[PDB]
């Protein structure tokens, strides 16, 4: 039911899955996607309520700073436009 | 091996309450790495606290910090509410009896004003003595358009 | 118990704060709200005398500096019949 | 009905309703108006017998000034004119 | 859900700013749009507590550099049912 | 409630104007007027403890100068059933 | 019991306060509420020696400041049967 | 009554003094005595807000000099519904 | 919601009033009040993550001073199912 | 066009003249005049974002001296669909 | 069935036990109950007429200071209330 | 799994936080809570030896700076068959 | 086993020989080989955390000299079910 996006950029899939597992061990969110951007760039996209998303991304950032090539970015869009849902794949 | 690794996965979040109580277990304030919560980081928030003073300390300057320190009670700032001018059910004063032992803190849902506290117990309240309301009617005189009612009048 | 508590403050922010304090710290009934004009906002609650007293204590407590602050809190213990059209 | 007019004006209606309580507690006076002047001024009209209105206004001017910002303007009217009645709700 | 956020400001322009920040920040439906009088204007939104906090942050820093800015900014955690007529 | 508030005066006119303040300030019903003898007059009001306290406060603050003045005005929130024969 | 405890005071309010302290201070039954005249009011309690002693001491030193004040406080332990007309 | 009068002390001689003073002062129904652990004894009574306040005031004034003494002279006016299962 | 808020303190008064803070702040239900032993008493509620955060902070913000005050107050967003028998 | 423009000023002289500047400056339809209160008057216009932007600029530099001055000005391209009741 | 209630606090079971013994020896008063408060606190609760309770409590307080940890609290209730009776085995 | 893990701490807050760390670091099942007394609390967990080790160190890292803090933490790879019927 | 072990490197030659080390070092079943992109290759294996650690360390120690070397060797002993759709 959550609409807020919590999502992580990582160079390397190791910090990507570590971030995703931090997402699911931090707060009640479901990952809507795992995307291979290219050149080691990988994102994890999770949906949920604003507080749960914020806590999850907090844990993911605190976990992925040093793993592999390292964390690239964390961002917490909380209310995407109705047209942005197709951009995340639905 | 002679090469000591450094720790990680520090899940517990040691934040600090609005009145400096060590709160623990995650935190949803401002992180040095996350993006998107930057807006409104150093803005006053009257009411139920949700952002830590650690966030203010490491993202905002000192005046915001001690303004938050002053602000953000929960429901009971206790007896700081001295004058109600509503016939004052009050604690004794002019009438004896219940006046006995009228100095201890109720430390909860307030009932009596601090002015009655002073007029009964010579000391100021053992709870918040600075008496937020207190002045109430007394301040008056040049209140007129106090605060900022656009000063149209 | 029809003891009438009421408070007035600048801006309806502390007004609704202390109205929540009313209904959140004592078993009183919110008979209504009123917008005086020029930023003046009042709230009118009804209940038991001691309950209404504690309620307005808490309301003035939570209203004191937030926003533009409280103007006048008050408790009347036995309102009259003639006051009902005025409330 | 007693045409004797009492009216009390205050800043904010907390002192206005304190004055109204003094009215309805003192003497045989019926509040005929509770109006908001504008910009915070609140004033109350009661009507009744001359002595009754006088005593009521006395009680209001005794119990109104020290309530919040307090009383701003009170008076009595003894024998109000017929042409004023349209301005009194007609 | 029923968690109430609300912002007071001076005039309508920062009020519209605050409402726009409410709607672009988080999942909140604005439920109240009050012209208090004397310049005070208030916006009332409902939603989830954290969503309410994020919206309030965005509004607070979205309506202070515009015009003469806000004067008040509050977050109800849960409005008591007695407050429903006020909304 | 079950509280009984008491007022004492030098003479009965201050006592019963205090009783008027009692029954007109808060939701308290007076059960008795008693002429002690030698001018001492007491009035006994019955009602809620907070209401009784507020009413007694109002009456005492009203009646210092009325007549020759007050004597005693203290309350017990729970007078014994054994006091009822004295009531 | 056969022990009689009993007190005067000036004013009925301190008298009933003292009798109230009588009836909760110790297990005792009160038998007399006498208006002496001129303001003296006498309270007569009946019970065993220890209960009446403790109750009278408590009521007296609680009623000293109440109202106008007490009159006398000494108590007899084993009254003679001949005090029957005092009933 | 819904309001809660509710205290700890160390060792329960002051606990019974608190409860006794509860009864002496105002009408509160003793809903629970509890041994917290390590010697903390908590007393819990229900009654009117003003009655609870007066009773708790008396209990605090009467229990602190005896034994180890008082811990908290604390009162809740609205025990919310979810608190009741803990009572 | 299945987020868990949770506090520990010294005695029953801080725990009970912090439970009041929970049940008046956010959509949380008191799932448990446990006597740890030696005086430690803990309160356990379930609600929404942000709601849980706001509620528990309000509870600590109230309980720092009641009695001898707070000791511990931690927050978990998602409790693991295998922990649930401990609830 | 759904783009929004709206400005605030003290007194209706600058309000109407700036609305005139807007309607000579770009394809904008004056959808609202609002006497906000306390001398505040606000004008609301629909239009295309470039047009309404040029119009809000024209209104801004129209009354630097007209009346007693501006209060605020800005642009909204996409208000939320649910802000229409606020419009 | 004297309603007067004496009750004594002791740190440790010893002083409570000889407190009860002294209660019984000083006067023919009845004990209503001993309680383990917790944390080493043990409490004795006796009933009787007011004077006998006073004498017994005085004797126990005299006899318990030296033995063990000694007294913690000691006081006399002359008229326990009906509302306190449910705390005594309702 | 047959390997046993013990987490001891001061208070139930760090206890269940460490329990979450247990069940949320590795494949382990807690078999029990137990309040030792005086505030000491233990959680008993079972599972695979390496799973027990990872979980127990995770709880150790988690618990020292939560509330009053950790006290003890241990691993038993083979609990004897005489130990479980007194688990 | 359900715990995850996994290896990342540049070029899958070190990846596959490290996977050989995985499956010759401890009883672990590999679930996937994935081309991350830009030469980044990862291998994902099941196992119990003891076997996971042994195998993952074996692959890391046998993998650095081959090709471009490691990028990250990581283990998680408690993988969530919710993570599986990403696997």
From Swiss-Prot, chains A, D, K:
Family: Belongs to the bacterial microcompartments protein family. CsoS1 subfamily.
PROSITE patterns recorded: BMC_1, BMC_2
SUPFAM superfamilies found in the cross-reference section: CcmK-like
Main location: other
Keyword Coiled coil: no
Any one of the GO BP annotations: photosynthesis
Organism expressing this protein natively: Prochlorococcus marinus subsp. pastoris (strain CCMP1986 / NIES-2087 / MED4)
Gene name of the record: csoS1
Cross-referenced PANTHER family: BACTERIAL MICROCOMPARTMENT SHELL PROTEIN PDUJ, PROPANEDIOL UTILIZATION PROTEIN PDUA
Keywords: Bacterial microcompartment, Carbon dioxide fixation, Carboxysome, Photosynthesis
A molecular function (GO) term: structural constituent of carboxysome shell
BMC domain segment(s): 4-89
Role description: The major shell protein of the carboxysome, a polyhedral inclusion where RuBisCO (ribulose bisphosphate carboxylase, ccbL-ccbS) is sequestered. Assembles into hexamers which make sheets that form the facets of the polyhedral carboxysome. There are estimated to be 538 CsoS1 hexamers per carboxysome; note this number includes the probable carboxysome shell vertex proteins CsoS4A and CsoS4B.
Name of this chain's protein: Major carboxysome shell protein CsoS1
Subunit (UniProt): Homohexamer with a small central pore. A CsoS1-CsoS1D-CsoS2 complex can be isolated following expression in E.coli. Forms a CsoS2-CsoS1-RuBisCO complex.
Listed GO CC annotations: carboxysome
A Pfam family hit: BMC
Entry superkingdom: Bacteria
Chloroplast found in the keyword field: no
Subcellular location: Carboxysome
Domain comment as written in the entry: The tight homohexamer forms a small pore which is positively charged.
UniProtKB/Swiss-Prot annotation, chain B:
Function per UniProt: Required for alpha-carboxysome (Cb) assembly, mediates interaction between RuBisCO and the Cb shell. The protein is probably highly flexible. The C-terminal repeats act as the encapsulation signal to target proteins to the Cb; they are necessary and sufficient to target both CsoS2 and foreign proteins to the Cb. The N-terminal repeats of this protein bind simultaneously to both subunits of RuBisCO. Probably also interacts with the major shell proteins (CsoS1); that interaction would increase the local concentration of CsoS2 so that it can condense RuBisCO and full carboxysomes can be formed.
Subcellular location field: Carboxysome
Keyword tRNA-binding among UniProt keywords: no
Keyword set includes Hydrolase: no
Gene Ontology biological process: carbon fixation; photosynthesis
Single GO MF descriptor: structural constituent of carboxysome shell
A GO term from the CC aspect: carboxysome
Keywords tagged on the record: Bacterial microcompartment, Carbon dioxide fixation, Carboxysome, Photosynthesis, Repeat
Post-translational modification: Unlike H.neapolitanus and predictions for P.marinus strain MIT 9313, this protein is not thought to have ribosomal frameshifting.
Top-level taxon in the UniProt lineage: Bacteria
Assembly with partners or alone: Probably interacts with the carboxysome major shell protein CsoS1 via the N-terminal domain. A CsoS1-CsoS1D-CsoS2 complex can be isolated following expression in E.coli. Interacts via its N-terminal repeats with RuBisCO.
Family (UniProt): Belongs to the CsoS2 family.
Swiss-Prot/TrEMBL M-repeat repeat ranges: 11-60, 71-121
Full-length numbering of the shown residues: 460 to 612 of 765
Free-text comment on this protein's domains from its UniProt entry: Has 3 domains; the N-terminal domain has 4 short repeats, the central region has 6 longer repeats. The C-terminal domain has 2 repeats and a highly conserved C-terminal peptide. The C-repeats serve as the encapsulation signal for the alpha-carboxysome, and are able to target foreign proteins to this organelle.
Protein name: Carboxysome assembly protein CsoS2
Main location: other
């Amino acid at each position: 039911m959550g609409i807020a996006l919590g999502m992580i950029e990582t160079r390397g899939l190791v910090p990507a899955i570590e971030a995703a597992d931090a997402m699911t061990k931090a707060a009640e969110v479901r990952l809507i996607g795992r995307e291979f951007v290219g050149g080691g760039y990988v994102t994890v996209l999770v949906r949920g309520e604003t507080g749960a998303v914020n806590a999850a991304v907090r844990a993911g950032a605190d976990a992925c700073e040093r793993v592999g090539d390292g964390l690239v970015a964390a961002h917490i869009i909380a209310r995407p436009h109705r047209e942005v849902e197709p951009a995340l794949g639905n | 091996c002679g090469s000591t690794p450094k720790p990680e996965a520090r899940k517990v979040g040691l934040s600090l309450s609005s009145k400096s109580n060590l709160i623990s277990g995650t935190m949803t304030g401002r992180s040095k790495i996350v993006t998107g919560d930057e807006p409104g980081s150093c803005k006053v928030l009257t009411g139920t606290p949700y952002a830590g003073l650690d966030q203010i300390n490491d993202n905002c300057n000192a005046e915001i910090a001690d303004d938050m320190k002053s602000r953000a009670t929960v429901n009971s700032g206790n007896n700081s509410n001295a004058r109600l001018t509503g016939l004052q059910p009050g604690i004794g004063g002019v009438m004896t009896g219940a006046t006995k032992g009228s100095c201890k803190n109720l430390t909860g849902t307030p009932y009596i004003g601090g002015d009655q506290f002073l007029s009964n117990c010579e000391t100021p309240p053992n709870d918040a003595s600075y008496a937020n309301q207190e002045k109430s009617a007394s301040n008056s005189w040049k209140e007129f358009s106090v605060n900022s009612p656009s000063r149209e009048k």
